[PDB]
């Protein structure tokens, strides 16, 4: 029952689950009645969802993955837990290889979990093994990690993955589990179709929505004192405990370096200490400023794309975007650095049609430079498509969280006075209608 999962969880891996979803996903794999899809975040609970069932399975669990780094790092950890896990890769000595292939062909093999590349899984040099495994009914699950690699609307398309559809079909008896971290509903629809996944596909997608975060859009065209507006915003978000004075830290994002330097200074002078972060600075300078912000010598940082959340923070109570980001995902990713501690936080986008256009041009320029180097890809469509969705995020009226959830493919979220539009629908209508007056400035 549930009983089995608890014991195998503690006895081996030494744990309860990180998410009640992670639990219910794993459980549904284990019952093995249905193919299953998992789109969780970079939180490696995805791994556990297929691994734990595999050990309960009284049969062999194949596990496709696209490159070796990914495999090795996991199979090592699986070994550390005293688990009969095996890799079959083209970076393997002839003798190692032939020893495993032999293992698989045995009545009652050593191997419980086989990590294969799509290359090996395709190669005729493995097919008979495959068939004989099937024939002895010794295959208990087929797993497809980084499933997004099957979709051209994905960020990491690998033709090899396309072959996997046929494979699933061949391995009829066995359920299939697909997993990824980042899947637009287009990707997920590609997955279900490309990997010929049997209905009913059971789905375990972690929603992108987060209660404690408050999204809003402002229009730089409808603001007399921009710098002042930012001060007020930073101030309201910080100093949530006024007897202490200033509590928490926050981020300001720019496209350009001059913007960053200039904006740090303007904020600092208005009484809100901020330091700049851009690739323009020397490496030493950057690593110092990061510490200052991390130790809360400086409550605010003003940064370009080069942040990369190398070391992210719990008490980030505001992320303000001075220019629109390249993608809805890029804004979600960036803004998502806010409120990791679960305490109320503020995410603000400062939209401009002037900005929209300059970035649209820069996207077009850096796409044309790849088309002449390479050619016409369905990914070039996606680059612009990804950006159009975020222009639409700004320019349309509606729950800011539900606009996000549409793009990522989540249920309509429980906002609860959790964004500008949900809080005051009339002031948003005003601000939009206002952008039409000031359309010609």
């Amino acid at each position: 029952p549930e009983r089995r999962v608890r014991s195998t969880l503690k006895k081996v891996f030494g744990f309860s689950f990180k998410t009640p979803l992670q639990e219910s996903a794993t459980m549904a794999v284990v019952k093995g009645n249905k193919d299953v899809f998992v789109c969780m975040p970079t939180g490696a609970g995805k791994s556990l969802c297929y691994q734990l069932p595999a050990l309960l399975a009284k049969g062999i669990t194949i596990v496709v993955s696209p490159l070796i780094a990914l495999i090795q790092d996991q199979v090592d950890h699986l070994l550390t837990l005293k688990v009969r896990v095996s890799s079959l890769n083209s970076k393997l000595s002839a003798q190692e290889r032939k020893e495993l292939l032999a293992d698989l062909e045995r009545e009652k093999p050593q191997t419980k979990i086989l990590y294969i590349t799509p290359e090996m899984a395709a190669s005729s040099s493995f097919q008979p093994t495959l068939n004989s495994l099937v024939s002895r009914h010794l295959l208990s699950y087929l797993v497809v990690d980084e499933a997004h690699c099957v979709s051209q609307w994905g960020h990491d398309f690998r033709p090899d993955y396309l072959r996997l559809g046929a494979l699933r079909s061949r391995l009829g008896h066995a359920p299939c589990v697909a997993l990824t971290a980042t899947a637009t509903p287009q990707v997920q629809e590609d997955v279900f179709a490309a990997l010929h996944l049997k209905k009913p596909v059971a789905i375990f997608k972690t929603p992108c929505f987060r209660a404690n975060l408050f999204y809003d859009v402002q229009f730089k065209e409808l603001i007399s004192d921009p710098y002042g507006n930012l001060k007020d915003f930073c101030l309201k978000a910080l100093g949530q405990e006024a007897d202490k004075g200033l509590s928490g830290c926050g981020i300001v994002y720019c496209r350009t370096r001059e913007a960053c330097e200039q904006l740090a200074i303007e904020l600092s002078c208005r009484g809100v200490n901020a330091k700049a972060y851009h690739a323009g600075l020397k490496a030493s300078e950057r690593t110092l400023v990061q510490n200052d912000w991390m130790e809360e010598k400086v409550p605010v940082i003003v940064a370009t794309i080069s942040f990369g959340m190398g070391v992210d923070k719990a008490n980030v109570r505001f992320v303000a975007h001075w220019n629109i980001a390249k993608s809805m995902a890029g804004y979600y990713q960036e803004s998502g650095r806010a409120g990791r501690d679960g305490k109320p936080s503020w995410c603000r986008l400062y939209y401009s049609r002037n900005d929209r256009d300059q970035v649209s041009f820069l996207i077009r320029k850096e796409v044309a430079k790849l088309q002449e180097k390479r050619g016409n890809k369905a990914s070039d469509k996606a680059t612009i498509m990804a950006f159009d969705a975020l222009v639409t995020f700004c320019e349309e009226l509606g729950c800011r969280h539900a606009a996000i959830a549409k793009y990522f493919g989540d249920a309509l979220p429980a906002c609860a006075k959790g964004c500008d539009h949900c809080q005051n629908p009339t002031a948003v209508r005003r601000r939009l209608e206002a952008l039409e007056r000031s359309s010609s400035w």
Epitope: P185, F204, G409, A411
Partner: nanobody
Framework: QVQLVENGGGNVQAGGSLRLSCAAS????????MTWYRQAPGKEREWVAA???????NYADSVKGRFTISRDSAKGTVYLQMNSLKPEDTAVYYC???????????????????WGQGTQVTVS
């Protein structure tokens, strides 16, 4: 689970009209293809008309321009307007919810095809 239920069926005279709706219960996010099928007793199921996610509509050549299907996106309900009926059109009418992506905010959801109960429709 998911429920697909039809209504709007009944008895009419030749050259009459009816409007049919199949109501989709459950945490629906999308339905790849909602399809209208009719079952004359003692004969083969007939494909009638169908609407894709994003409102693209196609109809059988036997019911072209007489029948017309629509989605009240807000309602989450699809309608088959049947005007200029004939005794041929006398059948049971039901829907196929092909590629029915359901999902709650817990992350827990499914993807399956559902078939409706179906409403009796007689044309004198």
């Amino acid at each position: 689970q998911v429920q697909l239920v039809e209504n709007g069926g009944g008895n009419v005279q030749a050259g009459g009209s009816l409007r049919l709706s199949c109501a989709a219960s459950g945490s629906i996010f999308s339905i790849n293809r909602m399809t209208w099928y009719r079952q004359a007793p003692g004969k083969e199921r007939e494909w009638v008309a169908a609407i894709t996610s994003g409102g693209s509509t196609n109809y059988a050549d036997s019911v072209k321009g007489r029948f017309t299907i629509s989605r009240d996106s807000a309602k989450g309900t699809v309608y088959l307007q049947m005007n200029s009926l004939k005794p041929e059109d006398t059948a049971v009418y039901y829907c196929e919810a092909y590629g029915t992506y359901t999902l709650a905010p817990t992350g827990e959801g499914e993807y399956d095809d559902y078939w409706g109960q179906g409403t009796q429709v007689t044309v004198s």
